[PDB]
Symmetry: D2
């Protein structure tokens, strides 16, 4: 249920293949705009109504731009008629030590299979 195209609340698109070995691979488009993503998921989740745990990372460098930063999303996939990937994220920028206190933003993204 994870493999495919997902859309967040703010116009980003998250394209992923969930491999048999637990790998997540794909591309993330935040709007020149496409970036590699890589992560992991629980390939043997419970079958009791619980979600499937997962996470992935995008480093914001491609052949066109480099923000010197990376985001990790941590969350769970929930299947069914209104399937979702519900996540919280951390976005760390490369900084000097003096600016490291303000290096990390936090937020949350909800992904759906149908454009918002």
């Amino acid at each position: 249920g994870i493999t495919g195209t997902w859309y967040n609340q703010l116009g980003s698109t998250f394209i992923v293949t969930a491999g048999a070995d637990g790998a997540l691979t794909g591309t993330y488009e935040s709007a020149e705009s496409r970036y590699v993503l890589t992560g992991r998921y629980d390939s043997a989740p419970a079958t009791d109504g619980s979600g499937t745990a997962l996470g992935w990372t995008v480093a914001w460098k491609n052949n066109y731009r480099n923000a010197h930063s990376a985001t990790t999303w941590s969350g769970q996939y929930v299947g069914g008629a209104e399937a979702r990937i519900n996540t919280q994220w951390l976005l760390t920028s490369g900084t000097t030590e003096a600016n490291a206190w303000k290096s990390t933003l936090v937020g949350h993204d909800t992904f759906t299979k149908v454009k918002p």
Copy 2:
């Protein structure tokens, strides 16, 4: 650089390779939690960082399933590598467990780990 064997402040072991393409690959052995032996990790890093003294941004994920245990959970670490005399990777992390919807509000733990190339 990033490639090497690292240890967090609690004794976990982070064996990572930073590839030419921005890929992080390797294994993680946890000193806490419902964990036993090595787990696969994968992630990404900035392969062309700034040249102004700033650190190198990175992140990686471990899903806590291997051939011996499955905790139905996954941790992501987000941080930066800082070079120098004692190289360091400073991170914050999120650990999400699979839950029912009614329990989703308590699904995610947060903390911070610092990694060096020497054991604590």
Copy 3:
């Protein structure tokens, strides 16, 4: 209109708050989840002179989960901003830390996000 009033989050918790002229937040919180029963004291702070460029109003508050009925040995802080408009909203992220031993401190803190409206969802 403003921060003062009765608010509800997406899970049905009830947040009754007064925003004082000095920047103070006071009131009570009743949680729809967790080891909680009835109302708990909250205190916090807000920006009493927000920017005039369309930005929201920054704020935060704390509940320690002890009252006359129960004590969960934990505390939540919500950090967020009030957004005025047709449907007023307070958007927050929160940290819930439990008292633990040192060996369990790594798993002491939960994180999440709550959105509050003056209309109960």
Copy 4:
């Protein structure tokens, strides 16, 4: 309770708090220098009847970064636990939210951690 008094973080910030009998935290948060322009009101809550099994004491507090001299249009909350003893600590994680437009709300909140001690 051991909480009342002056505490110092790892980066040169100071706070002076009073822990009231029924769970109130009140005080001031400032910089190491301590000039009036760096001082802000703080308010929060703590568990006034913690466990007796060796666990820490849960607490939290908020500073809105407005005083009579400047206004950053932002607020920080610290969530953590107090641990007593000869090397007492308050170990926290924090969230700093700025007032933003909706278009910029995705980047409104910074996260980090502070460790407070009784000595600078």
